[PDB]
UniProtKB/Swiss-Prot annotation, chain B:
The gene is RPO26. Component of the RNA polymerase I (Pol I), RNA polymerase II (Pol II) and RNA polymerase III (Pol III) complexes. Component of the RNA polymerase I (Pol I) complex consisting of 14 subunits: RPA135, RPA190, RPC40, RPA14, RPB5, RPO26, RPA43, RPB8, RPA12, RPB10, RPC19, RPC10, RPA49 and RPA34. The complex is composed of a horseshoe-shaped core containing ten subunits (RPA135, RPA190, RPB5, RPO26, RPB8, RPB10, RPC10, RPA12, RPC19 and RPC40) where RPA135 and RPA190 form the DNA-binding cleft. One of its GO terms (cellular component) is cytoplasm. Belongs to the archaeal Rpo6/eukaryotic RPB6 RNA polymerase subunit family. GO terms for molecular function: DNA binding; DNA-directed RNA polymerase activity. DNA-dependent RNA polymerases catalyze the transcription of DNA into RNA using the four ribonucleoside triphosphates as substrates. Common component of RNA polymerases I, II and III which synthesize ribosomal RNA precursors, mRNA precursors and many functional non-coding RNAs, and small RNAs, such as 5S rRNA and tRNAs, respectively. Pol II is the central component of the basal RNA polymerase II transcription machinery. RNA polymerases are composed of mobile elements that move relative to each other. The lineage of its organism: Eukaryota, Fungi, Dikarya, Ascomycota, Saccharomycotina. Present with 6090 molecules/cell in log phase SD medium.
From Swiss-Prot, chain C:
It comes from Saccharomyces cerevisiae (strain ATCC 204508 / S288c) (Baker's yeast). Component of the RNA polymerase I (Pol I), RNA polymerase II (Pol II) and RNA polymerase III (Pol III) complexes. Component of the RNA polymerase I (Pol I) complex consisting of 14 subunits: RPA135, RPA190, RPC40, RPA14, RPB5, RPO26, RPA43, RPB8, RPA12, RPB10, RPC19, RPC10, RPA49 and RPA34. The complex is composed of a horseshoe-shaped core containing ten subunits (RPA135, RPA190, RPB5, RPO26, RPB8, RPB10, RPC10, RPA12, RPC19 and RPC40) where RPA135 and RPA190 form the DNA-binding cleft. Belongs to the archaeal Rpo5/eukaryotic RPB5 RNA polymerase subunit family. It is found in: Nucleus. DNA-dependent RNA polymerases catalyze the transcription of DNA into RNA using the four ribonucleoside triphosphates as substrates. Common component of RNA polymerases I, II and III which synthesize ribosomal RNA precursors, mRNA precursors and many functional non-coding RNAs, and small RNAs, such as 5S rRNA and tRNAs, respectively. Pol II is the central component of the basal RNA polymerase II transcription machinery. RNA polymerase complexes are composed of mobile elements that move relative to each other. The chain holds residues 109 to 215 of 215 of the full protein. It comes from the Eukaryota. The lineage of its organism: Eukaryota, Fungi, Dikarya, Ascomycota, Saccharomycotina.
From Swiss-Prot, chain E:
The lineage of its organism: Eukaryota, Fungi, Dikarya, Ascomycota, Saccharomycotina. Mutagenesis experiments demonstrate that the minimum viable CTD contains eight consensus Y-S-P-T-S-P-[A-S-N-G] heptapeptide repeats. Identical and simultaneous substitutions in a number of consecutive repeats are lethal: 'Ser-2' -> 'Ala-2' (14 repeats), 'Ser-5' -> 'Ala-5' (15 repeats), '2-Ser-Pro-Thr-Ser-5'-> '2-Ala-Pro-Thr-Ala-5' (10 repeats), 'Ser-2'-> 'Glu-2' (15 repeats), 'Ser-5' -> 'Glu-5' (12 repeats), '2-Ser-Pro-3' -> '2-Pro-Ser-3' (15 repeats) and 'Tyr-1' -> 'Phe-1' (12 repeats). Zn(2+) 2 binds at C106, C109, C147, C166. Belongs to the RNA polymerase beta' chain family. This is DNA-directed RNA polymerase II subunit RPB1. The tandem 7 residues repeats in the C-terminal domain (CTD) can be highly phosphorylated. The phosphorylation activates Pol II. Phosphorylation occurs mainly at residues 'Ser-2' and 'Ser-5' of the heptapeptide repeat. The phosphorylated form of Pol II appears to carry, on average, one phosphate per repeat. The phosphorylation state is believed to result from the balanced action of site-specific CTD kinases and phosphatases, and a 'CTD code' that specifies the position of Pol II within the transcription cycle has been proposed. The chain holds residues 2 to 671 of 1733 of the full protein. Mg(2+) 1 binds at D464, D466, D468.
Curated annotation (Swiss-Prot), chain I:
The binding of ribonucleoside triphosphate to the RNA polymerase II transcribing complex probably involves a two-step mechanism. The initial binding seems to occur at the entry (E) site and involves a magnesium ion coordinated by three conserved aspartate residues of the two largest RNA Pol II subunits. Present with 18700 molecules/cell in log phase SD medium. The chain holds residues 1128 to 1224 of 1224 of the full protein. Zn(2+) binds at C36, C39, C55, C58. This is DNA-directed RNA polymerase II subunit RPB2. Belongs to the RNA polymerase beta chain family. Transmembrane segments: none annotated. DNA-dependent RNA polymerase catalyzes the transcription of DNA into RNA using the four ribonucleoside triphosphates as substrates. Second largest component of RNA polymerases II which synthesizes mRNA precursors and many functional non-coding RNAs. Proposed to contribute to the polymerase catalytic activity and forms the polymerase active center together with the largest subunit. Pol II is the central component of the basal RNA polymerase II transcription machinery. It comes from Saccharomyces cerevisiae (strain ATCC 204508 / S288c). It is found in: Nucleus. A zinc finger (C4-type) spans 36-58. Coiled coil: none annotated. Component of the RNA polymerase II (Pol II) complex consisting of 12 subunits.
Length: 267, 87, 107, 171, 654, 10, 112, 166, 97, 10
DNA sequence: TTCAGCAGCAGGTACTCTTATTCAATATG
RNA sequence: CCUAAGAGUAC
DNA sequence: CATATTCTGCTGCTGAA
């Protein structure tokens, strides 16, 4: 029954999910436009932890001493202190991180940090570390402006929708906002310069691989997602106070006016 | 049909080739090679039509264009030359 | 908007539809005690303008009937005073992408 | 009468024919297939205009077949006889029932019932001719004829004419 | 031989337009008029002219061509006949609809009861979809029992505007079996609404009226719901022991002849009505034998008659049993056994199955030679060829052809030859609940009567080896073969969209061994190390430096298993209580393809998210992941073979 | 329903 | 809110035995069930009554009645669904069939 | 639409019911609409000559009645091959019944008939048939009846007869 | 072997449309039938040896097409026609998507 | 109604 | 300001094998 | 050859 | 003497107080 119901659902070339009549079921597949096979569980580092831990992990102050960065971290470590434009860049990066923290806490109420996202940033960082032989002792060649602008450009390059109008652009920004939050959480200036210690070419390689992997993870138009969903629901059901399992699935799919255990939850 | 055809300068589809597009391109090219179509790439001795088509796709010598259909009937013509094969 | 205590007599319901463009909407007090739109299961509903509806149908190449439907008896549709043919943008906090924007047409 | 009209033909090409001269093969197969043809929808098709760049379009591969289906669009000159239309012609044959006059690529059979009583058949003359007191209509004789009946035969269109109207007959 | 060449243009169906036959359309398309219930003439050797098996409808014998199209049974689609019914009868499937339509339209003047002057009729007629329009029009007009020759004015209900009404009272209509009975409100009179008067009132419905009722002017007019000419399907529809439909059509003709003779010779209305009811019952049971309440029309042998509706519906019906799911050729089915020595994407195919299933390879200059050799081999040995498809449509069978001499292959011909190694084949276990239960494997011809598959691929198939049977399908074209290899391939299905995690993993013995091999106690001496290194097909040829060099060179199991792990893989999983040092040897740390620490078990090499399988397939590719499956299986199976594992009663004793 | 799961109705 | 509750119920059913299914599959299911403005069931009375083509509607259940209604109403079947092309034995516009492959004369001449 | 079976008026040139596909306006291959231009015998002859000479030039890169017949035969055999009996007969018919000679006269005639603002079929019939007087032309072509005034038709036919050459 | 409904659904999920078409047509039943563009019915008399195509009733001879449908589909359409339902098969779109 | 779908009424 | 009269029976996916039979009884050419 | 029934095979 | 026929799962009121 499920497969017959969902058989005509397909992802079309405008990334919309439509049936045989052309009716839109989802304006983008899975509300993110990503293939399920390219999704892995990753930790969003901004939603969890404490405020002090968050500031220690992310905040960088070029003009004060409480949250400054060690000048040995980067090559221009003694000349960037006292700079103002770079301080503006750090301020906006941290403001964006705070906004991302608030947004993630608004999305996931339980504060769960491990959620399925397409591109595994951790493995890309590890691959760069093993490929370029980061010695963890030489000061980083990167400039902070390079890091911030590269992150912004990489976000601009993560295209799910290619349209050139306000509706498609806004939908594109909506479809990548969670992955963009993950990218900013991982590729932060303090984290890059301290925890990972990227070089210039290592950072550029990380950016390029993130872009390539994100573009590779996009759902392919023509995917018969309706049958995939129906089978992905039916097969675990075959593997199988309140009724559960096959009878409850029957009561859900067959929208039954009367069910065995009608329960209500009050907070 | 002029209204159906979206102009090339404002195609809104991905510049990458889908897995279904690649599979159909390889199948069509192999079926053409099996039926004595001219080969546009120099063979290194391979006799399988499928791997001949794979070699043709690797260096972009497949003279086919994908007509991708939008749900309203409009279509976009993407040449195999300009389609990026990342997978 | 008419707010009543218990019920409206059927002899008064029939004259609720007045001369256009005046639309009379009747609401029961018991149903208005709890604001449905504050439930975390209820996402954000924003009524789209005629220009916005035209732009949405143009950019997505959609017809009148190819959009997802919202009944003209849905509690949110009554809350926002939807009339038929008007499209509501639905902002949803999705767990795959942080923001999702759907659209539902009134029927 | 003569017109020029927009026509489209569907041509299927085998996979073996997709060499650099695909355009030339398509154009040559358009010829010999529609050139000098007859159909009830458009009458006679005599020649194709604007041969320099005939719109061949892309060409769609038939799935599971490999043959490409082209929708070639072109300008074609058409000679469609119409009911009750006057056209000039050259008489090529005469018989008891009527006479056959050559109009363009077609032969129009004008019956003996559709002539004035003064014009009468004469099989004694060699060749037989529709002779009158004032003139004689022989082989290779000009005549203006109003076509009033056409029967659609795909192999060769047939028409029936008349010269009863005023100033209809030999010029 | 298939079907010979036809000059008609080849197109695909773009739109299917449904509708009803007009009686004149049936009379126009019918190639013969059926008048005799007997299917065979008095000689009992020929099809009777005018009978139900008229040769103009199609040939019932292979030896004869169809009298209409002059084609064989293979080509002839069958041409319809028509039976001219003496009196109109109700189409059973439309009776309810008829009951609705006649309840929406005045039974005397044939006009819709509530015109646009009714306020609710503007709302009802404005509905777009025809079904909803008809539902609204019916549920509002069924309660009106007067034609309303005069109606209150739309501007104000003071003056009266006169439409074309007749003022008669509409009857309340019920169905009593296959007939409609109308009760007129007493000024109640009960009488049967004759099909003739219903057809007359349906033919008088205006175009606007019935197009507002959901009908179409061209494709379905309401009066076409009444049967006056029955289309007789050709013998292809009812092949022969006569078919049930043939007996039903014979009964229909018998009833039609009886009614015709009774009407012509003059008879009481009782006998005429009885014959009419018999004809209606026969027609209805011919179209639908499962009418509720009425007794089923029994076949000659005392069993229910299979109607057209019974043929279409059900699991074994036309749609579900022959179109949505049909029996296909080039398929095999046999028992499955496990093979640790096969690749993940490799399936063992019995030699006999490979000899029966065949693939058509197009003769090409690149493969003219090898195909020729297969043609020389014949069908009785493997590898070989079973058929040669000539470009003229003739098919040379390799059996009974060695007498004729050697066959010269020409470009464009086809060699239908035994499936060989590395042939992409679809492989299935049914019920096949998901797409991973139907995957593309590569053929490996084996000399035993069972399908052999990797142990890791049994998990998506939900397959055991206690008698399970599995199915094998072979593509018969290059496009299907290519998309089978590039879309449905087993390595591509390693990570499933079902749970964004691998569906295949190390299972059963290979799992147990991989736990025993990766223990800290497990030390492997030089000879077994060399054997295990050689057992890895892609081993680079360098012997790893032993974990212990003196006083005796010993390799650990982790060191040997790290050879199978591809270079460049980093995995770090922290289990319960594990530290950077692993006192319990739990968790997992692999750096650059070397197992730094951790006992390898279900959490590492199983079908789990973030495990070795997932990391390898997301870093190096599905082919590398399948090769990892093979390498790990080979090394662990060899070690477990030379180490041993058991279980007994003492293992259950405390 | 059906049967099973007449109609409704009949 | 009904769609969100339906997804939560389906997810509870799936995760009752510890199994995990990606969000998009159940999201598609609950979006299909709620795309008509109300809760559409996976039953003869639900998805099989939407005007989505007589040939694919009849393939589920109530075949002959669906055909009769289509004949009476003179429905047009655009053959966009998978079942229509399966019944007609032609390539459905799914997967590899969601597009058309065409030959370019100019590109083929450009190669040689 | 898609009306099964066809009911339509019988074709009649006098009634100007040329056909469902011979209507006044036709969609060109460029996608826009153009008036159905109807070729008179001389204009059609020039069009055929231009098409054939252009085809001959493309294949190369890739007057009295007898000499014209020989020339058209040679050019026809050079341009096209077989199955041209219909085209040969049409070409000899055109060379026989030609009312205008070259580009200048046919251009003048076509612009003059365009200035008349009459139906393209009617102006093509005017150019096709070489009449003498006004009412004689009216009775030759029944589609001309009550479409233009007698004096205007007479004067335009006088200019046509003046442009009639050889 | 039965290529059932849900095996077809597995192939639909794979996206292998051409393999599904080959399974349902070439392997099982591939029937070439002649129809006309006037009425989509299969009432076209096709004398292939004589190269004659004629649909009686429509009185047409030049507007005939051929389609490849399963013989089960042809039997279904013919049974519908016997049941007073017209499955008119048209090879062109009368409506925009 | 009917029955089904007495009358009404009775 | 408010409520009593019914009624109709199929039912997952593939696959293997065996066994009985498909009116009896009576009238008429 | 068809129909019906029964016995099982793997889920 | 051989052949024709007699267990689960849905729906629509209005009349009379
Ligand atoms: Mg088992
Ligand atoms: Zn036949
Ligand atoms: Zn009336
Ligand atoms: Zn027809």
């Amino acid at each position: 029954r499920l497969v017959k119901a969902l058989e005509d659902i397909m992802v079309h070339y405008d990334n919309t999910t439509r049936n045989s009549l052309g009716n839109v079921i989802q304006f983008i597949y899975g509300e993110d436009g990503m293939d399920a096979a390219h999704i892995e569980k990753q930790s969003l580092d901004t939603i969890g932890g404490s405020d002090a831990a968050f500031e220690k992990r992310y905040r960088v102050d070029l003009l004060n001493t409480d949250h400054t960065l060690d000048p040995s971290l980067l090559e221009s470590g003694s000349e960037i202190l006292g700079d103002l434009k770079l301080q503006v860049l750090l301020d906006e990066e941290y403001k964006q991180l705070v906004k991302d923290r608030k947004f993630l806490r608004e999305v996931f109420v339980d504060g769960e940090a491990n959620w399925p996202l397409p591109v595994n940033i951790r493995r890309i960082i590890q691959n760069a570390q093993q490929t370029f032989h980061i010695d963890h002792t030489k000061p980083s060649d990167l400039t902070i402006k390079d890091i911030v602008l590269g992150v912004k450009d990489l976000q601009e390059n993560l295209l799910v929708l290619r349209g050139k109008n306000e509706i498609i652009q806004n939908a594109q920004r909506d479809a990548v906002t969670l992955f963009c939050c993950l990218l900013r959480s991982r590729l932060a200036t303090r984290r890059v310069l301290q925890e990972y210690r990227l070089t210039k070419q290592a950072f550029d390689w990380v950016l390029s691989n993130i872009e390539a992997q994100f573009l590779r993870s996009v759902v392919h138009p023509g995917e018969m997602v309706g049958v995939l969903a129906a089978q992905s629901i039916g097969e675990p059901a075959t593997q199988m106070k309140v009724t559960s399992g096959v009878p409850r699935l029957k009561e859900i799919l067959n929208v039954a006016k009367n069910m065995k255990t009608p329960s209500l939850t009050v907070y | 049909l002029k209204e159906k055809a979206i102009p090339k300068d404002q195609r809104a589809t991905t510049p990458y080739m889908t897995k279904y597009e690649r599979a159909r391109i390889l199948g069509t090219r192999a079926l053409q090679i099996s039926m004595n179509a001219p080969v546009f790439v120099d063979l290194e001795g391979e006799t399988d039509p499928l791997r001949i088509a794979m070699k043709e796709l690797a260096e972009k010598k497949i003279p086919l264009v994908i007509r991708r259909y939008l749900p309203d009937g409009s279509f976009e013509d993407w040449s195999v030359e300009e389609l990026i094969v990342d997978l | 908007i008419f707010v009543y205590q218990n019920n409206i007599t059927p002899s008064a319901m029939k004259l609720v539809p007045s001369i256009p463009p005046a639309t009379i909407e009747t609401f029961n007090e018991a149903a208005l005690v709890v604001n449905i739109t504050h439930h975390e299961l209820v996402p954000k509903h924003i009524r789209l303008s005629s220009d916005e509806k035209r732009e949405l149908l143009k950019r997505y190449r959609l017809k009148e009937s190819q959009l997802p439907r919202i009944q003209r008896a849905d509690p949110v549709a009554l809350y926002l005073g939807l009339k038929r043919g008007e499209v509501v943008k639905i902002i949803r906090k999705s767990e795959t992408s942080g923001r999702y924007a759907s659209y539902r047409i009134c029927m | 009468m003569f017109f020029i009209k927009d026509l489209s033909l569907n041509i299927t090409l085998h996979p073996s024919f997709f060499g650099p001269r695909m355009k030339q093969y398509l154009k040559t197969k358009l010829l010999e297939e529609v050139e000098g043809s007859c159909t009830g929808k458009f009458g006679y098709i005599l020649c194709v205009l604007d041969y320099d760049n005939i719109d061949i379009q892309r060409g769609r591969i038939l799935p599971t077949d490999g043959s490409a289906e082209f929708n070639v669009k072109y300008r074609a000159v058409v000679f469609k006889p119409f009911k009750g239309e006057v056209v000039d012609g050259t008489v090529v044959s005469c018989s008891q029932h009527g006479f056959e006059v050559q109009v363009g690529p077609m032969k129009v059979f004008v019956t003996k019932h559709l002539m004035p009583q003064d014009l009468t058949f004469n099989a004694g003359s060699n060749p037989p001719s529709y002779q009158s007191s004032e003139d004689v209509i022989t082989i290779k004789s000009r005549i203006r004829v109003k076509i009033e009946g056409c029967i659609s035969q795909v192999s060769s269109i047939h028409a029936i004419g008349s010269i009863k109207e005023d100033y209809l007959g030999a010029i | 031989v298939g079907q010979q060449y036809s000059s008609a243009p080849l197109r695909t169906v773009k739109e299917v337009q449904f509708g009803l036959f007009s009686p004149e359309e049936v009379r126009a398309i019918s190639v013969a008029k059926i008048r005799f219930p007997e299917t065979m003439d008095e000689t009992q050797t020929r099809a009777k002219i005018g009978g139900l098996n008229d040769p103009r409808l199609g040939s019932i014998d292979r030896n004869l061509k169809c009298q209409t199209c002059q084609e064989g049974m293979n080509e002839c689609p069958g041409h319809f006949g028509h039976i001219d019914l003496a009196k109109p009868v109700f189409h059973v499937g439309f009776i309810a609809k008829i009951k609705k339509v006649c309840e929406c339209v005045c039974m005397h003047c044939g006009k819709l009861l509530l015109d646009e002057h009714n306020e609710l009729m503007r709302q009802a007629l404005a509905i777009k979809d025809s079904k909803k329009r008809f539902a609204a029009i019916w549920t509002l007009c069924k309660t009106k029992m007067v034609c309303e020759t005069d109606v209150p004015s739309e501007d104000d209900p003071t003056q009266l505007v006169s439409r074309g009404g007749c003022g008669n009272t509409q009857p309340t209509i019920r169905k009593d079996g296959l007939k409609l009975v109308g009760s007129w409100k007493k000024d109640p009179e009960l009488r049967v609404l004759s099909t003739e008067e219903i057809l007359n009132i349906f033919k008088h419905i205006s175009v606007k009226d019935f197009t507002s009722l959901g009908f179409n002017e061209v494709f379905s007019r309401p009066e076409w719901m009444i049967l006056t000419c029955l289309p007789v399907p050709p013998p292809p529809v009812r092949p022969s022991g006569e078919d049930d439909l043939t007996f039903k059509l014979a009964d229909i003709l018998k009833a039609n002849i009886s009614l015709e003779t009774l009407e012509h010779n003059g008879a009481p209305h009782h006998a005429i009505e009885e014959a009419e009811s018999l004809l209606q019952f026969h027609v209805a049971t011919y179209m639908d034998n499962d009418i509720a309440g009425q007794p089923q029309a029994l076949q000659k042998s005392g069993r229910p008659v299979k109607s057209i509706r019974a043929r279409l519906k059900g699991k074994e019906g036309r749609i579900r049993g022959n179109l949505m799911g049909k029996r296909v050729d080039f398929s095999a089915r046999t028992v499955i056994s496990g093979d640790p020595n096969l690749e993940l994407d490799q399936v063992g195919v019995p030699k006999s199955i490979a000899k029966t299933l065949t693939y058509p390879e197009v003769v090409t200059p690149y493969n003219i030679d090898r195909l020729t050799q297969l043609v020389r081999n014949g069908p009785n040995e493997h590898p070989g060829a079973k058929y040669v498809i000539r470009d003229s449509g003739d098919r040379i069978d390799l059996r009974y052809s060695k007498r004729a001499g050697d066959i010269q292959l020409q470009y464009g011909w086809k060699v239908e030859r035994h499936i060989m190694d590395n042939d992409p084949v679809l492989f299935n276990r049914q019920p096949s609940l998901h797409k991973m239960s139907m995957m593309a494997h590569r053929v490996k011809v084996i000399p035993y009567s069972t399908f052999r598959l990797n142990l890791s691929v049994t998990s998506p198939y939900n397959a055991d080896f206690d008698g399970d049977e599995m199915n094998l399908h072979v593509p018969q074209s290059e496009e299907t073969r290519a998309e089978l290899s590039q879309l449905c391939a087993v390595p591509l299905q390693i990570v499933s969209p079902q749970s964004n995690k691998p569906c295949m993993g190390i299972v059963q013995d290979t799992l147990c061994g991989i736990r025993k091999l990766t223990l800290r106690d497990t030390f492997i001496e030089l000879d077994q190390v060399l054997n295990m290194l050689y057992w890895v097909p892609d081993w680079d040829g360098v012997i790893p430096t032993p974990a212990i060099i003196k006083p005796k060179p010993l390799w650990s199991g982790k060191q040997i298993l790290s050879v199978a792990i591809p270079n460049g893989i980093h995995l770090q999983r922290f289990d319960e209580g594990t530290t950077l040092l692993s006192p319990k040897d739990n968790g997992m740390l692999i750096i650059d393809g070397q197992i730094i620490f951790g006992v390898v078990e279900k959490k590492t090499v199983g079908s789990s998210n973030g495990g070795l399988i997932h990391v390898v397939t997301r870093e190096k590719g599905p082919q590398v992941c399948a090769k990892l499956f093979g390498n790990i299986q080979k090394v662990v199976n060899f070690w477990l073979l030379h180490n041993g594992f058991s279980t007994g009663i003492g293992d259950t004793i405390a | 329903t059906x049967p099973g799961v007449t109609x409704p109705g009949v | 809110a009904g769609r969100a509750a339906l997804y939560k119920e389906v997810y509870n059913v799936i995760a009752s035995d510890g199994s995990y299914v990606n969000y998009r599959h159940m999201a598609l299911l609950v979006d299909v069930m709620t795309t008509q403005g109300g809760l559409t069931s996976v039953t003869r009375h639900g998805f099989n009554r939407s005007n989505t083509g007589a040939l694919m509607r009849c393939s589920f259940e109530e075949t002959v009645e669906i055909l009769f209604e289509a004949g009476a109403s003179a429905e047009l079947d655009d053959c966009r669904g998978v079942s229509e092309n399966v019944i007609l034995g032609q390539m459905a516009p799914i997967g590899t069939g969601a597009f058309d492959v065409m030959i370019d004369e100019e590109s083929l001449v450009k190669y040689m | 639409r898609r009306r099964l079976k066809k009911v339509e008026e019988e074709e009649n040139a006098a009634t100007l019911q040329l056909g469902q596909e011979f209507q006044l306006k036709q969609i060109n291959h460029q996608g826009e609409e153009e008036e159905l231009i109807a070729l008179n015998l001389s204009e059609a002859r020039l069009v055929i000559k231009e098409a054939l000479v252009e085809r001959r030039r493309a294949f190369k890169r890739s007057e009295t009645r007898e000499k014209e017949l020989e020339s058209i035969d040679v050019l026809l055999e050079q341009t096209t091959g077989g199955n041209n009996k219909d085209l040969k007969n049409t070409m000899q018919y055109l060379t026989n019944f030609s009312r205008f000679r070259d580009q200048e006269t046919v251009g003048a005639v076509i612009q003059l008939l365009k200035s008349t603002g009459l139906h393209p079929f009617e102006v093509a019939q005017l150019g096709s048939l070489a009449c003498d007087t006004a009412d004689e032309a009216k009775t030759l072509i029944p589609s001309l009846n009550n479409k233009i005034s007698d004096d205007e038709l007479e004067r335009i036919l006088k200019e046509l007869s003046n442009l009639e050459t050889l | 072997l039965r290529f059932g409904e849900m095996e077809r659904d597995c192939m639909i999920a794979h996206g292998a449309a051409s393999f599904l078409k080959e399974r349902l047509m070439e392997a099982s039943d591939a029937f070439r039938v002649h129809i006309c563009g006037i009425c989509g019915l299969m009432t076209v008399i096709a004398k292939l040896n004589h190269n004659q195509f004629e649909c009686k009733g429509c009185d047409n001879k030049i507007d005939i097409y051929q389609i490849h449908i399963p013989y089960a589909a042809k039997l279904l359409f013919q049974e519908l026609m016997a049941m007073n339902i017209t499955p008119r098969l048209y090879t062109d779109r009368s409506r925009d998507f």
